[PDB]
Design a protein around this ligand. Structure first.
Ligand code: NCD
Ligand code: DOR
Ligand code: ZN
Ligand code: ZN
Ligand code: ZN
Ligand code: ZN
Lengths: 344, 343
């Protein structure tokens, strides 16, 4: 009899659902399994108002198959032009669960992002005041910074000063990828948390580059050398309770991945949970798997833990080679592979 | 307006492939370069005089009339290669050099050398006959991070080898690091290196920032900017045991843009003008001719070419693609404006 792993229903604390037809195709892979997900706001144009978040939420709810108990937790894209009163109203009305800060860029349009942390202090101070968590894509994107250095550079140049200035602000260091960040989070206080994706636990940059270039392992922040991979696995395996499940499922059509300029992102919603289960098992740390998927996130966000359960079975299954879109196809994370754990 | 006249260059590291691909790519080389080192990593690899002779004829068959191009053939070293096979090839004017591919390190390398110890009698015979050893210098242990494989090779394989065969002539091919640049810079007259246009022009950020760019994916992998800057400084310095090796390494577009893209830049169409740009940028055009047309021949003990070509500083558009019969081929710098073109 195949081994069963029963957990409280998990949630995904970092998700891209896109919009339109792509949203219709990808939502079921989340809603079948997760109770809630943090839905990121990086649409074109981005979600920067309460009204757009409300409409987007409904588009998401329209696409949930009948009987799935799924609640999207919406976010606001932080920008220079964002009125702090719009952010607050959204939070007060339960529309925005959190706000997301993408890397600063002096050339970014004020409707589309942030020029500097200084420029958005009024808004960050308002989040601190009302207790809205800030989710951070923590990389500095200056042209003279080597891509593999960008996360470490952010800790020093942005994250520490920010947290030193806003001492009551709750911050999730999203999809951490380095020992620098794993140590930083491990040594932080109760106001600092992190998500980790399945790909940053399972692979390192050799898997993306040795024996060929694999654009389906291409994502941001970039896969790092093996020492960083190991630090991430050790962190989740330690039982540390301020790291939790965030897939960063980030779907692009195959034509946009397998081109002269491949888009960043892994479509891992279909296979993420089993992948995490495999990682915890390999680390002899299955006793901490539930907390990571189903408890740590809710505790940090001040939300209740789910009260229904799901089961994973240790029985080999093949992952689909691709998933049809209206036009084109999506190639899922671990496409065509035999995986060790699957949902029953 | 500015015209730069140089002795006709050679290419000391080239992949011409075979069949249709060969017929398509040879003219981009044969129209410009007097000679090329034609690497031996066909499938199956060129490991006998007979295969090299036939391959050479396939190449000559594809050279347009009017082009004065000579392919310099190489032997693909394997663990079980008879040193007599290699020596007969050298004696008959077939093999100019032999190429060491560490097993599984690169394109068509599964049949490659598993250790130096396995091929010592072959290397001792090369040392004795004066045949140069061309080296793809990377270790392959699964445990070693890809960006470290060139540096680790210097320490663990190259230095011991050269200490053991003190008269063996070695080209450290397509070097990519400061480690290799300093190593070559500080070596003796029996050590040289080639550098590609892409390792001079770009670093790993150009392949990975803003998207993943498979047409810049090649081996040894593009390194940090500090390494790129060291390579530029080396060629700019006028150091004379570095020379032109494009490592033009074509693959069909579909093979490049797949879920597992092949390693190699098709740079033959644009390499020479690209080198010119790098040399101009480094304020070192006085050293350009020697890199392209003199340093390689000196190291190999061959005469310099006796004809001349001109580069002009007129901005030109690189083609988006080049047709194959049942495929396309994307050139290095496809769709870019390039500063120098061959007149
Ligand atoms: N360098 C590459 O990226 N590719 C070359 C092989 C080689 O020079 O190692 C090829 O033949 O495809
Ligand atoms: O920062 C990001 C954005 C995401 C996306 O495609 O939306 N993809 C990634 O790889 N990481
Ligand atoms: Zn992100
Ligand atoms: Zn994301
Ligand atoms: Zn090579
Ligand atoms: Zn080569």
């Amino acid at each position: 009899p195949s081994q069963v792993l029963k957990i409280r229903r998990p949630d995904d604390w970092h998700l891209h659902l896109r919009d339109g037809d792509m949203l219709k195709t990808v939502v079921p892979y989340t809603s079948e399994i997760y109770g809630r997900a943090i839905v990121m706001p990086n649409l074109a144009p981005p979600v920067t108002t309460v009204e757009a978040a409300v409409a987007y939420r409904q588009r998401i709810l329209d696409a949930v198959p009948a009987g799935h108990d799924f609640t999207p937790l919406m976010t606001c894209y932080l920008t220079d032009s964002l009125d702090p009163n719009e952010l607050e109203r959204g939070f007060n009305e339960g529309v925005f669960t959190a706000a997301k800060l993408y890397p600063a860029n002096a050339t970014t349009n004020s409707s589309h992002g942030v020029t500097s942390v200084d420029a958005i202090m009024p808004v960050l101070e308002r989040m601190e005041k009302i207790g809205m968590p800030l989710l951070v894509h923590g990389e500095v994107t200056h042209a003279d910074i080597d891509i593999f250095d960008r996360e470490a550079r952010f800790i020093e140049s942005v994250m520490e000063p920010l947290r030193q200035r806003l001492t009551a602000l709750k911050v999730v260091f999203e999809h951490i990828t380095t020992k620098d960040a794993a140590d930083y989070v491990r040594d932080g206080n109760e106001r600092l948390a992190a998500t980790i994706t399945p790909q940053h636990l399972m692979f390192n940059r050799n898997h993306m580059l040795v024996g060929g270039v694999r654009p389906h392992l291409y994502c941001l922040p970039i896969l790092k050398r093996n020492i960083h991979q190991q630090a991430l696995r050790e962190l989740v395996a330690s039982g540390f309770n301020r790291v939790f499940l965030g897939t960063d499922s980030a779907p692009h059509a195959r034509a946009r991945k397998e081109s002269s300029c491949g888009c960043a992102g892994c479509f891992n919603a279909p296979t993420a949970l089993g992948s995490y289960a495999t990682v915890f098992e390999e680390m002899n740390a299955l006793q901490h798997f539930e907390a990571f998927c189903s408890v740590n996130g809710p505790q940090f966000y001040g939300l209740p833990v789910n009260d229904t359960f799901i089961e994973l079975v240790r029985e080999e299954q093949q992952v689909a080679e691709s998933i049809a879109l209206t036009d084109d196809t999506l190639v899922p994370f671990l496409a065509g592979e035999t995986v060790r754990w699957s949902v029953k």
